[PDB]
RNA sequence: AAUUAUAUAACUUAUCUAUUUUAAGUUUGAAAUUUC
RNA sequence: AACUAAUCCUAGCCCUAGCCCUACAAAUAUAAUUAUACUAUUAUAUAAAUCAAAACAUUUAUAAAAGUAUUGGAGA
């Protein structure tokens, strides 16, 4: 036969129904909420007009993205953007030469900084361009708060950005611990992101980690019926008093 | 960080549709890449002291890696945001 | 080649602060999607001699630090 | 029963089932009934049954007098665990 | 995490099921002595079936050690083994271990360490000698079986002479 | 053979590193083109 | 009216339509199907080529505008 939903319809239908529609709606709209990153190797045409072979007459125009390649380890570092660019190339930049494979690597690097909110310093793989949005940021904990899940590219920033938001959520005293008067001046300079604690669990959580942990949310040791029978009896008998 | 622009024009898709790449669209063009220049600047200041290059504390424009294989590395620079970016030339004029 | 070392072995989530990985503890098996539990010393409930381990020389009560040679 | 080192075989006196064999003497119950037997309308016994047969009386009579409570649930016949019986209804821990 | 074959807990000069436990790092400081120049005792010359050259078990003092034996070594012999580098170069005997300070120039030697701490890994095959080229200070020059012409710190251990069957080399 | 051979690999210069005052050349050749 | 043979109609299938879907015991991944410890535990790269270009080398698909312009050893 044929199916009524075509296959991409499948992972939606299976998204809407089972234990993923059970799912906390704050996390639910994070993951249905797409934001694309920050174009870093390609930019989209400036004009938005431009010359239709078969009619010759101006038309609109169309943007064809650079393919990209983020790596798993940007996930594990804190990357800027930045992306492993794998193609083929021109040499010397004009379309009369020789084609040669190629892979383009941006300069990554291993660097520690400094988190305030989590007052410890993390050693991680980052680019010059994280760099710079750290300072841009105001602090490396601000980068991380700031920046979302796409435009920071790190599952660990992103890792790190639900501690952080927890740490807000909560005014846990793990913050600079045994400062209580440090510990406010740092909730009060990131009061910004201060959010629920519910949501700020479930940021940044994959998918298998979530399902997984909604299941355990709902996981209850079963009933001794004996016991579901002495709360009905014990209903009965009650309403029987009235 | 590496740029890159296609050679060969995409047809167009339109509204609805999705253009259907060849094999000659599939060859980039180095417009920029990083990797073949020099480091370029990188703005600096200083944890430490450095040789030739000023002293700790101070605001230094220096190439990309060069001042972060040779400062910040050996702890000479950090990463310079404005508040201690004040800060720290604040000091300065205490040093 | 003089080998230091015998020659017959020779041919982040977790650091957070707030939150804690989840783990296959409670699928009591492994699993490749879930992170390794940490387990604490089992407990038998009972003594096996079989799975008995004898304590080194100087655990002993009996052990004395002069050397007696037999 | 175990085998021990060398391959040698060490019965176990525990894992060797003892046969309970229940007093035949007397008992009017035997392999067959008679065709003049009627047959009873089938009653299984379960979970509710029970409890209504055992545990509603006990609860009920409290309950009117006002001698009930959480703590003493365990009174009406709750097990909260079945570790320490001989016959462990879960998890099964002995033969037929 | 293949089970060694090798599962004797302590090193013994007794055929292990036979295999024979070989030292090939020669100056052990043997119990009852100092880190200073010590002798030991030639038992027998065997042959080791998981090594190319025979092997001298050298018994000193108090311990008992299996040792590849060089070219004259023998059932009987006394082997001297001396970790002292003194000003003036130390008595060499055709088998023994010194430091290459204690060596004299053009002296066959086997059994060298190109590191020192490193333990003997060249010139232990049967007749191979290496030739001490030359010494200076703490530094000397030993060519190696692979041709190889190396220099090396006078920490490094040298056993003097060639290793057993002399005409390997010569063989037709 | 004739002509070459930014497959790779090397070196040199960049690059990238230390301090401190892959790209382009060339070479090997994965090979390519043409003939005998 | 002869031996060998022959006779038969349903077993079911096929294509669209409609519809997606969200439905004994015992033993077993160890050596699967071995009633209890050992030994830690695990899939998947451009899809290619064939093929077309009468060989082969870049290359070769897999509602109207319109098989038009463009693209292409401007050739399939």
Same mark, same amino acid.
């Given at each position: 036969?044929?199916?009524?939903?075509?296959?991409?319809?499948?992972?939606?239908?299976?998204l809407?129904?089972?234990?993923?529609?059970?799912?906390?709606?704050?996390?639910?709209?994070?993951?249905? &909420?797409?934001?694309?990153?920050?174009?870093?190797?390609?930019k989209?045409?400036?004009?938005?007009?431009?010359? #239709?072979?078969? #009619?010759?007459?101006?038309?609109?125009?169309?943007?064809?993205?650079?393919?990209?390649?983020?790596?798993?380890?940007?996930?594990?570092?804190?990357?800027?953007?930045?992306?492993?660019?794998?193609?083929?190339?021109?040499? #010397?930049?004009?379309?009369?030469?020789?084609?040669?494979?190629?892979?383009?690597?941006?300069?990554?690097?291993?660097?520690?900084?400094?988190?305030?909110?989590?007052?410890?310093?993390?050693? %991680?793989?980052?680019?010059?361009?994280?760099?710079?949005?750290?300072?841009?940021?105001?602090?490396?904990?601000?980068?991380?708060?700031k920046?979302?899940?796409?435009?920071?590219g790190?599952?660990?920033?992103?890792?790190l950005?639900?501690?952080?938001?927890?740490?807000?959520?909560?005014?846990?005293?793990?913050?600079?611990?045994? #400062?209580?008067?440090?510990?406010?001046?740092?909730?009060?300079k990131?009061?910004?992101?201060?959010?629920?604690?519910?949501?700020?669990?479930?940021?940044?959580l994959?998918l298998?980690?979530?399902?997984?942990?909604?299941?355990?949310?709902?996981?209850?040791?079963?009933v001794?019926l004996?016991? %579901?029978?002495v709360? &009905?009896? %014990?209903?009965?008998?009650?309403?029987?008093?009235? | 960080?590496?740029?890159?622009?296609?050679?060969?024009?995409? *047809?167009?898709?339109?509204?609805?549709?999705? *253009?259907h790449?060849?094999?000659?669209?599939? @060859?980039?063009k180095?417009?920029?890449?990083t990797?073949?220049? *020099?480091?370029?600047?990188? =703005?600096?200041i200083?944890?430490?002291?450095?040789?030739?290059?000023?002293?700790?504390?101070?605001?230094?424009?220096?190439?990309?890696? @060069?001042?972060?294989?040779?400062?910040?590395?050996?702890?000479?620079?950090?990463?310079?945001? *404005? =508040?201690?970016?004040?800060?720290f030339?604040?000091?300065?004029?205490?040093? | 080649?003089?080998?230091?070392?015998?020659?017959?072995?020779? /041919?982040?989530?977790?650091?957070?602060?707030?939150?804690? !990985?989840?783990?296959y503890?409670? /699928? /009591?098996?492994?699993?490749?999607?879930?992170?390794?539990?940490?387990?604490? !010393?089992?407990?038998?409930?009972?003594?096996?001699?079989?799975?008995?381990?004898?304590?080194?020389?100087?655990?002993?009560?009996l052990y /004395?630090?002069? !050397?007696?040679?037999? | 029963?175990?085998?021990?080192?060398?391959?040698?075989?060490?019965?176990?006196?525990?894992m060797?089932?003892?046969?309970?064999?229940?007093?035949?003497?007397?008992?009017?119950?035997? +392999?067959?009934?008679?065709?003049?037997? +009627?047959?009873?309308?089938?009653?299984?016994?379960?979970?509710?049954?029970?409890?209504?047969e055992?545990?509603?009386?006990?609860?009920?009579?409290?309950?009117?007098?006002?001698?009930?409570?959480?703590?003493?649930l365990?009174?009406?016949?709750?097990? +909260?665990?079945?570790?320490?019986?001989?016959?462990?209804?879960?998890?099964?821990?002995?033969?037929? | 995490?293949?089970?060694?074959?090798?599962?004797?807990?302590?090193?013994?000069?007794?055929?292990?099921?036979?295999?024979?436990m070989?030292?090939?790092?020669?100056?052990?400081?043997?119990?009852?002595?100092?880190?200073?120049?010590?002798?030991?005792?030639?038992?027998?010359?065997?042959?080791?079936?998981?090594?190319?050259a025979?092997?001298?078990?050298?018994?000193?003092?108090?311990?008992?050690?299996?040792?590849?034996?060089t070219?004259?070594?023998?059932?009987?012999?006394?082997?001297?083994?001396?970790?002292?580098?003194?000003?003036?170069?130390?008595?060499?005997?055709?088998?023994?271990?010194?430091?290459?300070?204690?060596?004299?120039?053009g002296?066959?030697?086997?059994?060298?360490?190109? $590191?020192?701490?490193?333990?003997?890994?060249?010139?232990?095959?049967?007749?191979?000698?290496?030739?001490?080229?030359?010494?200076?200070?703490?530094?000397?020059?030993?060519?190696?079986?692979?041709?190889?012409?190396?220099?090396?710190? $006078?920490?490094?251990?040298?056993?003097?002479?060639?290793?057993?069957?002399?005409?390997?080399?010569?063989?037709?």
């Open positions: 036969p044929l199916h009524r939903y075509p296959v991409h319809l499948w992972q939606k239908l299976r809407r129904q089972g234990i993923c529609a059970r799912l906390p709606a704050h996390f639910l709209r994070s993951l249905e &909420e797409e934001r694309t990153p920050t174009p870093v190797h390609y989209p045409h400036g004009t938005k007009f431009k010359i #239709n072979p078969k #009619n010759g007459q101006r038309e609109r125009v169309e943007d064809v993205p650079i393919p990209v390649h983020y790596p798993p380890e940007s996930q594990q570092g804190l990357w800027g953007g930045e992306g492993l660019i794998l193609g083929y190339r021109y040499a #010397n930049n004009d379309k009369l030469s020789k084609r040669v494979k190629k892979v383009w690597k941006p300069q990554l690097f291993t660097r520690e900084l400094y988190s305030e909110i989590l007052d410890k310093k993390f050693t %991680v793989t980052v680019t010059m361009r994280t760099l710079d949005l750290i300072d841009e940021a105001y602090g490396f904990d601000f980068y991380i708060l920046t979302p899940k796409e435009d920071l790190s599952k660990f920033g992103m890792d950005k639900r501690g952080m938001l927890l740490r807000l959520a909560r005014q846990d005293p793990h913050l600079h611990p045994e #400062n209580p008067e440090r510990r406010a001046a740092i909730y009060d990131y009061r910004s992101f201060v959010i629920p604690e519910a949501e700020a669990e479930w940021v940044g994959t298998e980690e979530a399902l997984e942990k909604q299941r355990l949310l709902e996981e209850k040791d079963p001794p004996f016991k %579901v029978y709360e &009905e009896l %014990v209903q009965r008998l009650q309403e029987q008093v009235l | 960080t590496v740029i890159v622009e296609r050679w060969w024009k995409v *047809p167009l898709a339109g509204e609805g549709r999705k *253009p790449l060849h094999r000659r669209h599939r @060859v980039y180095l417009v920029e890449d990797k073949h220049r *020099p480091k370029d600047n990188l =703005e600096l200083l944890t430490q002291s450095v040789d030739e290059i000023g002293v700790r504390g101070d605001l230094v424009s220096v190439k990309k890696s @060069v001042g972060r294989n040779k400062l910040l590395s050996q702890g000479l620079a950090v990463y310079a945001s *404005p =508040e201690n970016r004040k800060l030339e604040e000091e300065k004029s205490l040093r | 080649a003089y080998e230091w070392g015998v020659r017959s072995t020779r /041919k982040r989530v977790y650091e957070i602060p707030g939150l804690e !990985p989840i783990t503890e409670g /699928k /009591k098996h492994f699993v490749p999607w879930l992170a390794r539990p940490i387990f604490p !010393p089992w407990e038998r409930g009972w003594n096996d001699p079989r799975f008995h381990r004898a304590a080194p020389i100087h655990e002993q009560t /004395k630090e002069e !050397p007696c040679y037999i | 029963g175990i085998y021990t080192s060398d391959r040698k075989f060490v019965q176990i006196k525990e060797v089932p003892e046969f309970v064999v229940p007093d035949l003497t007397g008992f009017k119950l035997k +392999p067959y009934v008679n065709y003049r037997a +009627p047959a009873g309308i089938d009653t299984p016994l379960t979970a509710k049954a029970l409890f209504q055992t545990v509603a009386p006990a609860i009920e009579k409290d309950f009117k007098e006002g001698t009930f409570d959480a703590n003493n365990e009174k009406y016949g709750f097990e +909260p665990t079945q570790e320490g019986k001989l016959f462990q209804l879960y998890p099964k821990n002995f033969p037929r | 995490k293949f089970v060694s074959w090798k599962s004797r807990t302590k090193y013994t000069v007794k055929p292990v099921k036979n295999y024979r070989i030292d090939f790092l020669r100056f052990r400081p043997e119990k009852e002595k100092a880190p200073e120049p010590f002798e030991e005792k030639v038992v027998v010359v065997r042959y080791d079936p998981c090594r190319s025979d092997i001298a078990l050298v018994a000193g003092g108090s311990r008992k050690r299996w040792i590849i034996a070219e004259n070594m023998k059932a009987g012999d006394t082997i001297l083994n001396s970790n002292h580098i003194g000003r003036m170069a130390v008595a060499a005997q055709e088998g023994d271990a010194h430091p290459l300070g204690a060596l004299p120039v002296t066959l030697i086997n059994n060298v360490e190109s $590191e020192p701490g490193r333990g003997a890994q060249y010139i232990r095959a049967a007749g191979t000698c290496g030739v001490l080229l030359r010494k200076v200070n703490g530094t000397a020059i030993i060519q190696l079986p692979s041709k190889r012409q190396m220099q090396v710190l $006078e920490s490094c251990t040298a056993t003097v002479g060639r290793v057993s069957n002399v005409n390997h080399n010569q063989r037709v």
